[PDB]
């Protein structure tokens, strides 16, 4: 009966850092994806394994929505087959992903003239993430893998800050990102 709560995801007040990305399960509801695809608003709206404008014709077992912020130049890493600090150490899509990646510029809500440094990303890690893996640890990193206690030689804090200012070019501006994963294997999320 009830409509899927895409508004609570896309219009949420607070989005997380990409290393601490958050997931909402969407189930047992009617999804009208034209609220997404019939709008001109997204800077990125890329689907994999599925056509955006055909979503209202399909039923899925579940839909997942993953939310986070990255700078504009990093949105390209939120795709199957990419590498880079974001895809490798923060948020990884599988090569055979079925779903859509949506992103939009949020300069006036996530940046400020004096600079917003609260959004973070992981830049050091022993090994790449598996697809949809999340790592929210904050363990001092050493290249030899041995434990270390900052401040010390060859010991590094693994998270770094984005610095979001209103005055930078768009590649450095903040973008909110929602990744919709469509699960096939009884369907609970259907178009109208």
């Amino acid at each position, epitope marked *: 009966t009830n409509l899927c709560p895409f508004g609570e995801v896309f219009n949420a*007040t*607070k989005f997380p850092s990409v290393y601490a990305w958050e997931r909402k399960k969407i189930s047992n509801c009617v999804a009208d994806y034209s609220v997404l695809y019939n709008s001109t*608003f997204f800077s990125t709206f890329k689907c994999y394994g599925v056509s955006a404008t055909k979503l209202n014709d399909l039923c899925f077992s579940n839909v997942y929505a993953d939310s986070f912020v990255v700078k504009g130049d990093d949105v390209r890493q939120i795709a199957p087959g990419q590498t880079g600090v974001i895809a490798d150490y923060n948020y990884k899509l599988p090569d055979d992903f079925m779903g859509c990646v949506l992103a939009w510029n949020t300069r*006036n*809500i996530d940046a*400020t003239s004096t600079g917003n440094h*609260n959004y973070k990303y992981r830049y050091l890690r022993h090994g790449k993430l598996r697809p949809f893996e999340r790592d929210i640890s904050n363990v001092p990193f050493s290249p030899d893998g041995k434990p270390c206690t900052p401040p010390a030689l060859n010991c590094y804090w693994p998270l770094n800050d984005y610095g979001f200012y209103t005055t930078t070019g768009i590649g450095y501006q903040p973008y909110r990102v929602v990744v919709l994963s469509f699960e096939l294997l009884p369907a609970t999320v259907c178009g109208p």
Partner: antibody
Amino acid sequence: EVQLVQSGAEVKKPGESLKISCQGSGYSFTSYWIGWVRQMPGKGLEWMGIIYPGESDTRYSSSFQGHVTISADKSISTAYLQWSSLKASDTAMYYCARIRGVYSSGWIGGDYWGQGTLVTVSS
Amino acid sequence: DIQMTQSPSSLSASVGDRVTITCRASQSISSYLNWYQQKPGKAPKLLIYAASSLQSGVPSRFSGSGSGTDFTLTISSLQPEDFATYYCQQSYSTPRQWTFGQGTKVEIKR
């Protein structure tokens, strides 16, 4: 019900410090931006700034950070507006207001408002 | 900076009249336009947000339209409790630049 309750009317002399407050109830205080609005006598409305409680995130309007500090103590669901050295020109009504939220790439206005705090500054 | 200018600054109307108040922004603010009501001595009240979305509890005789630089608040049939001052406010910018219009006072014609 959502309620914002402000501290009472203030009468101060120029050069004095002053901290007024606004306590939210009936909603998750750490989940909404809350901010302050000035209405000088006979004049319209001006945002002073907003704060997201329980994050470290205060966003001032215009040049207000040079004269006022906005802060919050999430542990008692209270937002504050404070001056270190008042001027007679600070005489005004001050409102606290909860920001409804955001959508797409911009903001919503204030959905719930406090009752107002009158501040008179005079020698 | 974004300047918000309302027209008219004052309007005299009768109960039952259709009332239109306009708000112009000095640059495009997309849909991020809010309207408030304020009566003497009382706090502002949000009527409309996102240019045309009615805040819960506000009567449907209030409606908003427009986009970009030009916006309208319409009261389809003015009622006795509607005589008040109305403000627009853009919320497109960062909070550093949020701005209100100067107000439109709707008074009773006699």
